Design a protein around this motif. Sequence first.
Motif, mmCIF file in Angstrom:
data_model
loop_
_atom_site.group_PDB
_atom_site.id
_atom_site.type_symbol
_atom_site.label_atom_id
_atom_site.label_comp_id
_atom_site.label_asym_id
_atom_site.label_seq_id
_atom_site.Cartn_x
_atom_site.Cartn_y
_atom_site.Cartn_z
ATOM 1 N N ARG A 139 4.852 18.671 7.281
ATOM 2 C CA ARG A 139 3.985 17.589 7.844
ATOM 3 C C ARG A 139 2.528 18.322 8.257
ATOM 4 N N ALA A 140 2.556 19.400 8.754
ATOM 5 C CA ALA A 140 1.257 20.067 9.069
ATOM 6 C C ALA A 140 0.504 20.345 7.790
ATOM 7 N N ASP A 141 1.150 20.792 6.685
ATOM 8 C CA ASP A 141 0.371 20.821 5.476
ATOM 9 C C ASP A 141 -0.216 19.781 4.784
ATOM 10 N N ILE A 146 -3.031 18.918 7.618
ATOM 11 C CA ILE A 146 -4.278 19.923 7.769
ATOM 12 C C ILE A 146 -5.052 19.823 6.416
ATOM 13 N N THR A 159 -1.785 14.505 15.557
ATOM 14 C CA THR A 159 -1.240 15.874 15.759
ATOM 15 C C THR A 159 -0.504 16.456 14.484
ATOM 16 N N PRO A 160 -1.043 17.687 14.377
ATOM 17 C CA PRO A 160 -0.240 18.279 13.020
ATOM 18 C C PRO A 160 1.086 18.517 13.157
ATOM 19 N N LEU A 161 1.375 18.681 14.326
ATOM 20 C CA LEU A 161 2.961 19.113 14.713
ATOM 21 C C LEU A 161 3.379 18.077 15.555
ATOM 22 N N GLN A 182 -1.422 26.155 14.392
ATOM 23 C CA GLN A 182 -1.697 24.992 13.543
ATOM 24 C C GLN A 182 -2.809 23.987 13.925
ATOM 25 N N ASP A 224 6.503 21.847 9.469
ATOM 26 C CA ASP A 224 5.572 22.565 8.902
ATOM 27 C C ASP A 224 5.439 21.817 7.612
#
Lengths: 331, 331, 332, 331
Positions: free
Chosen positions: D175-177, D180, D200-202, D222, D173
Amino acid sequence: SIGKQRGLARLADEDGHFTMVALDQRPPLLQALAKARGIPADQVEFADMLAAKRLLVEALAHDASSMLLDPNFAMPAAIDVLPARTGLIVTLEEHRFQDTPGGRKSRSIDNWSVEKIRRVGGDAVKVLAWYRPDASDEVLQHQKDYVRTIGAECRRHDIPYVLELLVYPFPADKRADLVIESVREFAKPEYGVDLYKLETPLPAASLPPMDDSAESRAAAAQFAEVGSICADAGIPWVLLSGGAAPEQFERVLSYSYAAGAQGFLAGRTIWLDAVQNHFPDREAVLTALKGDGMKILKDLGRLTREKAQPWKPDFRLEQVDREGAFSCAYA
Amino acid sequence: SIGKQRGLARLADEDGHFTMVALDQRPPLLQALAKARGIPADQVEFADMLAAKRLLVEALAHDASSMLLDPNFAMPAAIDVLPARTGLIVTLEEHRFQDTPGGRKSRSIDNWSVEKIRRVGGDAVKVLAWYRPDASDEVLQHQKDYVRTIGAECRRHDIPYVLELLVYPFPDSDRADLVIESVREFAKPEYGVDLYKLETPLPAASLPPMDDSAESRAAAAQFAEVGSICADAGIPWVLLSGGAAPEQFERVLSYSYAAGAQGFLAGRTIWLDAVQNHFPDREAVLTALKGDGMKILKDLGRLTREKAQPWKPDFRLEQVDREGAFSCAYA
Amino acid sequence: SIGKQRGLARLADEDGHFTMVALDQRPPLLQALAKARGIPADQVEFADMLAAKRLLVEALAHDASSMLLDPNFAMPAAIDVLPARTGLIVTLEEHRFQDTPGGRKSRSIDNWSVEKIRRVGGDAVKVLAWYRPDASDEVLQHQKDYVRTIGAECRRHDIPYVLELLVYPFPSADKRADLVIESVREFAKPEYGVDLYKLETPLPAASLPPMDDSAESRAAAAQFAEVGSICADAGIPWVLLSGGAAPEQFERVLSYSYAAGAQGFLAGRTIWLDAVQNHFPDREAVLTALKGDGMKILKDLGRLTREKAQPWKPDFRLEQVDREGAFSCAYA
Amino acid sequence: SIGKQRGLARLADEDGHFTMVALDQRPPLLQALAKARGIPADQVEFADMLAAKRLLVEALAHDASSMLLDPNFAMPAAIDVLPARTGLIVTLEEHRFQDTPGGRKSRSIDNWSVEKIRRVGGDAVKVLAWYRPDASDEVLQHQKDYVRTIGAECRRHDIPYVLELLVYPFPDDKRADLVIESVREFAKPEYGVDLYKLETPLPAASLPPMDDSAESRAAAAQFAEVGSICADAGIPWVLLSGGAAPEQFERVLSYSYAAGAQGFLAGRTIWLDAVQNHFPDREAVLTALKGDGMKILKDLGRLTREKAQPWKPDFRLEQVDREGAFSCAYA
C-alpha cells in the motif's frame, strides 16, 4: 494554439496572402471630415465619423482579405456592413499616446480589451507601438512591458497578436537601423507577436528600380535583414502604405516581397481624396473611390498575388492518441 | 448581441442560407468504421476516427456554408484542413447521455466548454438536447436547466447558441406534438437560443406532395406552427437529414422553406455508404462521395437557393453619439 | 449574487462594521516623501513609495477590517504583509483624471482590470468617480458610462463594487450638500450595480454642531438622513471618507452618519501623513509617531463604530434549489 | 502566483496551520443519512442532504481555519452561514467516477468549474483523483491528463489547486508503494499542485506509538519519504481522516507532522457519529457536534499547534522598479 492559426487564416485570402485595409483612423478621419465640412475639427459631429466609416467599409470590403476597425467609431458604424468572410482586426492601442521627452508611451483604448475583441467575434488584436531603440530607459521599459502584457492577453485568449511598429521624431541611414533593431526586439518569443505590420526600412522615395545594380542590392539588403528576423521568429510581415505615392509604395512592396513579406495594409491614401473632396455626398465619394483608391487597391492585391510568397498555417498539434486528450490539452 | 449576430453571419453563405454539414458523429462514425474494417466497434483505433473526419472535412468543406465539428475527434483531425471562410460550429454535448426510465439526461463533454469554443476561434456552440414534453418532471427540469445554463454561457461569451432538439423513445427492454412543444419551450427568452436544428414534425416518408389537398394543407400546417414559434421568437431554424433518403429529405425542405426555415444541416446521409464501403482507400472514398453524397449536397444547396428565405443579421445596436460609448456599452 | 455578498462580508469585521483603511494614495504619498527627503516629487525614487506602503500595511493592518490597496504601488509593496483575514479592496481608477473645463473625466488604471482583481484574490473592486450633478452633459455622460461599465464588469465576475463619489471645483453648505446628495442618488440606481458606497460628508465637518435636541442639529441631521434613506432603499451600505478633517470633526461626522444608518468609515491621509512626512526613511521613528497619533485615532474610530454604527448583515436571498445539479446550473 | 499564495494563506490559521474540516461528502454522507432513516441510499431526499451540511457548517466553522464544500449540496445549504474569515475550498471532481477494470476515471462536476469557484469567492479548488501507479496505461493517462488540465485552469485563474490523492481496490508495504509513488507522480511541476491532501501511507491501526523504537522508525521512514517529496516540490501537505478513530488519526498526524505535514483535512472522523445516530433531530445532532465532535476537532487543532510546522507564504515576486510594471507583469 489553434485560435491563433485559424485567426490568421481569416486575415489572409483563399491563396494565403494578406491584402488588408486599415479603417481605424481616429484624428485623420476627423480632420478629413473637418476639411470636407469646412468646419473646425472640434465641430465635427460623431454621426459624421460613423457615416464615413460605414461608407468606407461598404466601398472597400469586397477587395480586402481583412479590415482593421477601431472599437469606438468603425465598430458601431459598420459592423453590420462588414461581410462575414472578411477578417476583422480590432484596434487596441489608444491614439492619444504620451509624448514624453524620452519618447512615446502607449496604452490600450479605455474600456476596451483583448477579451472584448475575442467576445465580439474579432479575428485578431492590433497594437501600434511607437518605438525606437534610442528612446530613454523609462520609455523602452514602458513600451516593452505594454507589448508584452498584450502578448500575454492574446496567448490567454488564443487570438492573433498583430503588432504594428513605427519610428517617430523626439519632441535616412540612421532610420533604417532604428527600424530593423525595433523589429529584432519585438520578434523575441516573450512578446508573442503573430503578425508584423511594418514600415519600410528605407523611404519609398529613396528606392531605386529592382536591378543587379550596387545601389539596388544595398537597399534590398536592408529589407533582407527585416525578412530574415521575421522568418526566424516565424512571424509573417505586411507593409503599411505610409502615405507614399502609389508607384513609390508599389516599389516598396516589390522589394519587400523579395525578402519574404506576405502582404500589405492599405491606409489613408486610398480614400483621403474621396472623403475630403466629396463628403457627405455618398455617391460622389464612391465615384472618386472607384477610379482612384479602389484601382490602387486592386493593383496592390494583384502585385501581392504574383510576387508575394503565400503564408501557410502552421498547425504543429500534439499527438492526440485517445478520446479526450484534445480537450485536456487545450487548457 | 454583436458577436452572436456576426457569428451567425459566418454560419450562413453569401446570400444568407444555412447550407451546413454535421460532421460531429461519434458512435455512428465508429460503427461505420467497424463495418469498413471487418473488426468490431470496440476494436476501432483512434487513428481511424481522425483519418475518417479528415477525409470528410477535405471533401465537404468547400460545398458547405459552415460545418459542425466535435472537439475530441474532428478538431485535432481536421482543423488544419477546415477553410477559413467555412464557419465552424463546435459540439458541446456529450454523446454518452443518461438513459433513465423517465427520459434522457444531457451534459457537456468533459474538459470542454463554451469559453474554450470562443477561444479556439469557433463561430458557434452546438448543443443536442434529447427532449420529449411527456418526460418525467426530474428529466424535464434537468434538460431545461442544462439548456438554460449553456444559453447563459453563450450570452456571457457573446457567441451563438445553436440548439438541436430531438424526440426519442423511452428505454425498451426487449410524433408532431412532441416536436412542437419541444420547439415552443426552448424558444422562450430564458434559454437564449440563436439558431435551431430541428427535426421534421411529420415523418419524411409520410409527407404527401405539396398540393392544394386537405392532406397537404394539414401537413404543411404542422410545419407552419413550428415556423410561427421560430418567427415570433426570432430564432431561424434549419432541418437535419435524420437518415431520410435524398428525395424524402428534399420534400421535408420544400415543406419547411415555405413555413419559414432558413436552411439545412446534412449528416450521415452524405457519407455513410461512401465510408462503410471504401474506408480506408482515400481515392475510393472521394470517388464514392462525388458520385453520391456530394451530388445530394449540390441539390440541397440549389433547393435552398430556390425556395428558402434568406436570413438577415438583425443588428439592434443601441445608438452611440460619442467616442467611448461603444466600449462602455459593450460590457 | 453570492460572490458579492461573501466579498462584502470579508470587508467587514465579524461584528458587521466597516473599519476600513485607505492605502491607495499615489500623488499625496509622493508629496509626503518629497517633503521627507527634501527633494522634488519628480526625484522621488519608486523604492521609497514601496517602503512607505509596506510600512503602512504592517502598521495599520491590526486595526482595519479591510484595506484599500492600489495595484502599481501597494500590491508589489505589501501584499505579503497584508493579513489573510484583513479584506483586500483593490483600486481601479487612474489618479490622473482628465481635468476638462466642463468637468473631470475618469478612467481605469492601464493594464489593470476587474478580471485581474478577481484573479489576484481581491475581495472588492474600488472606483473613485469625480462627480458634480451640474457638470457638462459630455462629462456627465462620460462619468455615468464609466461607472456603469465597471458595475457590469463586477456583475460578470460577481465581485463587490465599491464606488467612491467626490465633488470638486471647476477649473454655500446647502449648495455643496445638493452636489453630494444628488450624486449619491444617481449612482444608487440599479443600472450601476453598486454594492458599497464610500461617501464624503454632505455638510462640512467644521460646520457640524453638537448632536443634541436643537433645531441646528435637526437641520444638519436631515442631510445625513437623506443620504441614509437613498442608500437603504437601494440596499447599499455606506461608509465615510475622513477627507482630511480633524479627528474630533471626523468623529462628529461619523455620529451624524451612524445615526442616519452608515455602516462604517474609510480612513485616509490623516492617520499617517505627518508620521511619514517627518520621519521617513527612519522606519522606527515613523511607527513611533504613528502609535502616539494615527493608531490612537483608528482605535477611537473603531470603538465609536462598535458602539454607534449599525451592523451590516449579509442577505444571501438565494433562490431555493430542489435537486443535485440545480445550484451549478443556476450559477452561470 | 499572488492569488495562489494569498489563497493558501486564507486556508490556514493566523500561525500558518491547516486545521481544515471537510463537509463535501456525497456518497459517504448519503449512506449516513440512509442508515439514520432506515430507507435505502436511493431513497434519501435532497432536503436531508442540505440540512445535514448546514448543521456541520453552523457547528464546526468557527473551529476550522477553512472548510471544503461541494457545489451542489453544501454550497446552497450553507454558504450564508459560512463565516467570512473561514477559508472556502470548493470541490470540483464528480463523485460518480468511472469504475473500469483497468482503474478509476475522474471528471469534474457537470456545469461547475475552476472559473465558477473564483467567481463565487472561493479561496481554493479541490480535486480528488483516484490513483494507483499499477493501473492500466489508459487509466494512468486519463488521470494524468485530468489532473494536469485542472492545474492549468488553476494557473489561469491564479487560485490554489488542492489535490487529494487516494488509492483504491481494482474491481472484483505494498500500500505504501501505491501511495508514495502516487505522491511522487503528482508532485511534478507540470500538474501545478499547490496543496496536498494525503491519506496515511501505512494503515492507522498498524501504527505503533511514537517512541524511539525499531517499529516506530520503520513506520516514520514511510512518512519521511512523503515529507521529502512534498518539501522538494515546495508543496505543503495535510492528512485526510479517512474515517479513522480519533486516537488513531492523532497517531497518523503525529507521524505526519514529525515528517513535515502542515495540518489535516478531517471529514467523517469529526462528525459521522453525530449525524448517523441522531438524524433528523436538530438539537440532538448539534449536541453531539458541540460536545463530542468538536472535542475531536479541538484536540486535532491542539496537536497541530504543538507539533505541526507552520506554513509560510513565498511571495517571491518578480521585482518591479517602476509605476505600471506590476500591472503589466500580472497577466
